[PDB]
RNA sequence: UUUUUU
């Protein structure tokens, strides 16, 4: 486990051969930490959630967000090293009939809204490439609150394109935007991915360690397999996110009408969507349908600020929110937030 | 709607 191995490595007290090997792995992982950001890789994942149960495991009680250890980043960068190695290997051997994974180049319009939000904030951001963006974003640690930096990171995480698997025979372009590497594929999970199963098959047929067949090298069939595995992949995150949304509703439903103070992260034309860190979820409140006459809303586009007769709301602010679940229709049990006039 | 373990 991670806590036990962390106490193994971080204490020089317990010393078998396995812990010595893990300390050597950590010393190599700090060199990977040296080269890591200098490659141009971004490790800025979305705000996660973890339920913790009760005496029954069917109604979980509390909601906790895990703080990551360094050994997670260690096995991360080792699997990145393995994937880069096998990608260059299959590129050298079978660049016409291998399964590769790309991240397309995003338009700068998705970065320009973030640059406008940084202009409202205390920081300028270069939208040229991932290198200058990551360097100017990592230099933006404000002593007012580091969680404003965290909100900037998750808003940058919101602004990306959808990576996919592709066959090279049918079509060509192999660059990857997110990892700042020229070519990439997945290899290190053949238990839970069929793409890694065909990666193992093509690598075993590549060095001649096992027999390949002509159905394993036909390109159009593979392109169809890449379309199928791209379709199956985007549905799975939809299912997982709907699952955590449903469970979250159950948790909220049995905690009555509790409330928080949250941070506003995105602004609607006539509504605003915020984040609550204590439960760590996203939630929108609409300012158009339960509202007064339209002159109480004044909206700007250069800076998306919404102005009321009392005060103009801005991004990255502590606000007054509540949690109430609606069941106006039994379909789509939805989380409503607040009411103001 | 990258990314690594489930």
């Amino acid at each position: 486990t991670y806590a036990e191995a962390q106490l193994r490595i971080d204490s020089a007290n317990m010393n078998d051969d396995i812990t010595t090997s893990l300390r050597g792995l950590n010393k190599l992982a700090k060199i990977l930490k040296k080269r890591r950001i200098e490659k141009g890789a971004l490790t800025l994942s979305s705000p996660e959630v973890r339920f913790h149960m009760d005496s029954e495991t069917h109604d979980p009680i509390d909601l906790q967000t895990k703080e990551l250890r360094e050994t997670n980043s260690m096995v991360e960068e080792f699997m990145l090293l393995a994937n880069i190695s096998v990608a260059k290997k299959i590129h050298e051997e079978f660049s016409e009939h291998a399964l590769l994974r790309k991240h397309p180049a995003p338009p700068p319009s998705n970065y320009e809204i973030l640059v406008k939000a940084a202009r409202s904030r205390n920081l300028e951001i270069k939208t040229d490439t991932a290198k200058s963006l990551a360097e100017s974003l990592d230099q933006a640690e404000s002593p007012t609150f580091p969680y404003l930096n965290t909100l900037l990171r998750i808003l940058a995480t919101r602004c990306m394109m959808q990576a996919v698997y592709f066959c090279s025979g049918m079509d060509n372009d192999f660059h990857h935007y997110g990892l700042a590497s020229p070519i990439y594929t997945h290899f290190t999970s053949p238990i839970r991915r069929y793409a890694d199963v065909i990666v193992h098959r093509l690598l075993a047929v590549a060095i001649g360690a096992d027999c390949t067949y002509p159905e394993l090298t036909d390109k159009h069939k593979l392109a169809d397999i890449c379309k199928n595995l791209n379709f199956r992949h985007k549905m799975a995150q939809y299912a997982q996110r709907a699952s955590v949304a449903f469970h979250t509703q159950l948790f909220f439903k049995s905690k009555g009408i509790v409330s928080e103070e949250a941070y506003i992260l995105f602004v609607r034309k006539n509504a605003i969507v915020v984040l609550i860190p204590k439960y760590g979820l996203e939630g929108t409140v609409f300012f158009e349908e339960k509202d007064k006459p339209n002159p109480q809303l004044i909206y700007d586009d250069e800076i998306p600020s919404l102005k009321i007769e009392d005060t103009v709301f801005h991004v990255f602010d502590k606000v007054k929110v509540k949690i109430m679940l609606d069941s106006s229709n039994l379909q789509h049990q939805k989380i409503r937030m607040s009411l103001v006039e």
Side-chain angles (χ1 to χ4, degrees), chain A residues 1-9 11-26 28-32 35-47 49 51-53 60 63 69 71-73 75-91 94-96 98-114 117-118 120 122-125 128-130 133-134 136-138 140 142-143 146-151 153-154 156-163 165-169 173-204 206-209 211-212 214 216-256 258-260 262 264 267-268 270-277 279-280 282-287 293 295 299 303-306 313-317 319-321 323 325 327-338:
Chain A
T1 58
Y2 280 91
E4 292 181 354
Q6 188 69 41
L7 268 69
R8 287 169 71 94
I9 296 171
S11 177
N13 342 52
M14 335 262 283
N15 255 73
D16 289 345
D17 293 332
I18 294 97
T19 312
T20 302
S21 65
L22 287 174
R23 291 186 183 96
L25 283 172
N26 196 1
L28 294 174
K30 290 183 181 180
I31 301 170
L32 296 174
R35 191 177 290 118
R36 180 180 65 191
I37 304 170
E38 295 177 353
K39 288 179 182 179
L42 280 75
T43 60
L44 297 177
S45 296
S46 66
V49 69
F51 291 101
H52 283 88
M53 284 67 252
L63 293 174
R69 317 319 158 106
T71 58
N72 295 110
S73 179
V75 296
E76 178 184 1
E77 297 298 323
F78 276 102
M79 295 307 105
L80 264 67
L81 182 63
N83 288 317
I84 291 167
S85 296
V86 301
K88 290 183 180 180
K89 174 65 178 175
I90 65 171
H91 194 264
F94 282 97
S95 65
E96 75 275 14
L99 152 43
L100 296 171
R101 181 172 176 85
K102 67 185 288 184
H103 191 193
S109 178
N110 296 115
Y111 296 93
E112 189 174 1
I113 304 299
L114 184 62
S120 296
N122 293 318
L123 225 274
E124 134 273 338
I125 298 299
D128 289 345
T129 58
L133 190 147
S136 65
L137 186 61
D138 288 331
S142 180
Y147 200 79
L148 270 70
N149 204 169
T150 303
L151 292 172
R153 303 298 172 88
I154 62 97
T157 309
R158 184 74 177 175
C159 297
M160 277 286 106
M161 284 297 294
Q162 127 179 193
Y165 292 108
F166 72 102
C167 183
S168 66
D173 167 6
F174 311 81
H175 302 291
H176 188 278
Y177 189 80
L179 292 173
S181 296
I183 195 166
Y184 189 78
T185 189
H186 278 164
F187 188 69
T188 67
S189 290
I191 294 175
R192 64 185 179 90
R193 289 171 181 169
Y194 187 71
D196 297 342
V197 174
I198 61 171
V199 175
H200 278 278
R201 286 180 177 176
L202 295 174
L203 186 57
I207 63 169
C211 294
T212 125
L216 275 73
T217 60
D218 195 0
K219 276 78 175 174
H220 300 291
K221 302 178 309 177
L222 290 215
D224 184 1
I225 290 168
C226 290
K227 284 185 180 179
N228 193 2
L229 296 174
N230 286 317
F231 177 80
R232 226 35 165 251
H233 178 74
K234 188 258 288 181
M235 294 300 293
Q237 292 185 358
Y238 295 93
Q240 293 177 335
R241 188 164 64 194
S243 177
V244 302
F246 162 74
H247 263 263
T248 158
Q249 291 196 316
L250 272 209
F251 150 95
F252 248 79
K253 136 73 69 40
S254 296
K255 256 203 169 191
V258 175
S259 297
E260 282 287 329
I264 293 169
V267 165
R268 293 285 71 191
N270 51 9
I272 52 172
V273 55
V274 307
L275 189 147
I276 292 169
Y279 295 93
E282 295 178 353
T284 189
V285 55
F286 296 97
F287 225 95
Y299 210 56
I303 86 179
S305 176
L306 187 61
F313 288 97
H314 303 284
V315 288
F316 302 105
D317 294 332
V319 292
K320 185 187 293 294
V321 294
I323 298 299
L325 74 156
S327 67
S328 66
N329 48 1
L330 296 175
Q331 293 177 335
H332 306 287
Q333 292 182 357
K334 185 170 70 177
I335 305 300
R336 193 177 296 276
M337 292 297 171
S338 291

